[model samples]
Target: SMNPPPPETSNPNKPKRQTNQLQYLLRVVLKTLWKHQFAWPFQQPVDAVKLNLPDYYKIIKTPMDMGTIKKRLENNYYWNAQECIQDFNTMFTNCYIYNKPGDDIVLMAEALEKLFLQKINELPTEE
Candidate 1:
C-alpha cells in the first residue's frame, strides 16, 4: 500500500482544539459553514465544491446544548435545523418555564423545517 500524506502540523496562529462535546459541535458547525465559503441554499454552484447534506445530518444528530445554540444563533444571523434542535433540547432539559414550551418547540421545529425547504428550493435543476 502507498504511504498516506503527512498529517497537518498544528499552527500556533490557529485556534486550539477543545475536544469536549460542545466544542466539537461548534467546530462541525463552523466547518460546515466554512466549507461552503459561507454560501447558503445548499446547492453546489457550477464551480462550487460539493457539500453532502447527509454528512451534515450526522453532525446534527449529536446531543446539543440549547443555551449554546441560542448564543451561536445570535452571533450568526442565519438559523437552521441544528440550532432549532439545540434550543428544543435546552428548553426541555432546563425547564425555563416559558409557560408554552411545547408551542415554542413546535414553532422552532417548523421554522427550521421551512428553512430546509427553502434551501431545497435553491438546489440546481437538471437541464
Candidate 2:
C-alpha cells in the first residue's frame, strides 16, 4: 500500500472567492475589455512618432495602456481594485486632454468608461 508521502490538503484560511481568485476574476474582466470595439487605441501604448503627435507627451504626463495594465495585473502590481481604477482614470483623462472634446478618441474613451464600470461592478469582491 503505497500512497506517496506528501503534504496533506490543508486550509489555514476560508476558501470562498479568496484573494488570489479575485485577482483571476479581475483578469477576466480586463481581457473582455480588450476585445471591445472601442478598445483599439487603448490596447497598446500610443506611438507619438508613428501618429506624428509631437505634443502628446507634453500634455499627457502619464501614459497608461491596456497592455501595460494587463502586465501589472499579472505581475501583482495592483494592490486592489481601487488602484486599478486609478490607472484606468489616468488613461481616459489623458485621452480627454490630448484630444478635443468632440474627437472620436475622446468619444470612444467616454463610452469605454461606462462599460468599464459595468464590468468592474459585476466582479465579486468578497475576500
Candidate 3:
C-alpha cells in the first residue's frame, strides 16, 4: 500500500504573486511586430545598396530601429493597449502615413493587422 500524502502548508510571510495582464498582452503585440519584420518591404534600384551610400544606410537602419522598438516594449509596461499602439503608430507614421508617392504601404496595413488588431480586441469592452 502507498503512504498518504502530507497536507499543504501555507506561509503568511510569502507574498502573493501578481501578474500584469496588460503587460503580458503587450508582449504578444511586440512579438507579433518582431515576427512581421520578416515580411517588411524594401525599395530598390536593386543595386541601391552598392550605388548609393544614403540608401545603404537607410537599408541597414531598419533592423536597428525595429530592435529599439522591441527593447522599449520589453523594458516598459503600458497601462493599456492603446498606449502601446500609439507608440507603434508613431514609429510607422513617417514611412507609412507620410511617405512619398509610389511607396509600398501594404506592409503598414499588414503590421497593424498582425501586431495590433487582435491584441486590441483582447482589451476589456468599455460598455
Candidate 4:
C-alpha cells in the first residue's frame, strides 16, 4: 500500500529565526567596512593585524574574491568572532601608537567588542 504525503503547513505569520548578536554585529561591521573601501579611490595602507580594514579592502577590490568574505562569515564560529575582535583591538592599539589618527575605526571596533561581550554574558551557562 502507498502512503500519502504530508501537507505543507508553514505559517506566514511565524516570526523569523533570531540570529546571534555577535554574528549579526560582525556581519554588519564587515559589510560596512567593505562598502567604505568600495567607494574609496586611492589605495589604502594595510595594518599589521590580519582581517583588518585593508585586508577587507583588498578582498572587495578583487573580482575573484568578491564573495570570499561572505563565505567566511557563513562558516565562522564564535571563536572566529573572538579572533576578529582581538584583531580590531590590535588595529586600534597600533593606530593609537601612531597618534590616534584612526579614532573612528577604533571606536567602531570597541563598540563591536562591547556588544559581543554583552551578548555572550546573556547566554545561559552549562552546569
Candidate 5:
C-alpha cells in the first residue's frame, strides 16, 4: 500500500497573529465563567477609553466598491461578515484588506452576509 501523506503544517516563516481585546472579551463571555461570575479574575476591572462616535462614524462611512465584493461573496470560502468581524476582534483586527479601502469594506460586508446564510443553513429542523 502507498504511504499516507504527511500532515499539513502552519507556515512557520509567517509571524504569529495577535488577538484583540474585543475577541478576548467574547471568549470570556461565551466560554468562561465571566458571564456569570463576579469574583476574582472575572470581577477584575479594566480601564475604559472614550472614543469620538462622530469621528469613528466618519472613518467607517467612506464609499465602497460593490461589484468586486459581490464576486468575493460568490467565490471566497470563508466569506462571512460575523465570522470576519469575530475574526477581526479575535485576530487583533488584522483584517486582510486590498490596496483599496472601499474594496475592503465591500469584502467585509459580503463575508458577513454569506456567514448569515451559513448560520441559517445550519439551524435545527425544528427551529
Candidate 6:
C-alpha cells in the first residue's frame, strides 16, 4: 500500500463532546452485570482449542464474550447501545442454544439477561 495523506482536523477547536448518555449508561450496565454472581461462565470466549468440543462452532454461529465486549466498548468500536446489547444477545443466545436446556450455564445466562435488561431500563431515550 502507498503512503496515505492524513485527513483534516488539525484546527484549534476541539472535537465536540458527546452529550448523550449512550456511552456512560451502557458502560455502567456492563460493569454491573460483570459483577453479577452468575457472570463467571461468560467471562471469556468459550474454549475452542482448550476444550474437547469439536463441533462447538458448527452449532454456534456467532459466539461472543464479556471480555471481548468490554474491550470493544473501551476501543470505541461500537456505534450505539443496541450494537452493544446485541453482543450480549449473541453471547447468551449462543450459550442457551449450544448447551442443554436448563443447564448450569444456560441458567446463569438467563439470570445475567435479567440483570442486564433491568439495568438497561434507564438507557436515555433522547440520544
The prediction achieving the highest TM-score against the true structure is 6
The per-candidate count of clashes, in order, stands at 0, 0, 0, 0, 5, 0
lDDT of 2 by residue, 43-123 (tens): 877877778887777766677877767766655565566666778888888888789888899889988888887877766
Minimal lDDT window, size 10, model 4: 1-10
The Cα error of candidate 2 at residue 25, in Å, is 5.6
Tens digit per residue, CA lDDT, model 6, 1-127: 1212221212335333332454754468778888899988787766755676667777766778887777666555565667678887888888878899878888888899998888877877755
For model 1 the local lDDT of residue 66 reads 32
In candidate 5, residue 85 scores what lDDT? 37
The predictions' CA RMSDs to the true structure, in order, are 18.4, 13.2, 16.4, 15.8, 20.5, 8.3
lDDT of 1 at 76: 44
Off by over 4 Å in 1: 1-61, 64-101, 125-127
Tell how far residue 49 is off in model 4, in angstroms.
16
- Structure candidate 5, residue pairs in collision: 79-111, 80-111, 80-112, 81-111, 81-112
User: Where's the lowest-lDDT run of ten residues in candidate 5?
Assistant: 39-48
C-alpha TM-scores of all predictions: 0.22, 0.77, 0.46, 0.32, 0.22, 0.78
Local distance difference test scores for all models: 0.35, 0.70, 0.44, 0.39, 0.30, 0.70
Instruction: Select the stronger candidate by lDDT from 1 and 5.
Output: 1
Error of 1 at 105 (Å): 2.2
For model 5, residues 9-121, the per-residue Cα lDDT tens digits are 23345444333422332333222322322212112111112322233223332222222222222333122334333432322122223124556434543454444344444
- The TM-score that candidate 6 achieves is 0.78
Model 6 residue runs over 4 Å out of place are 1-19
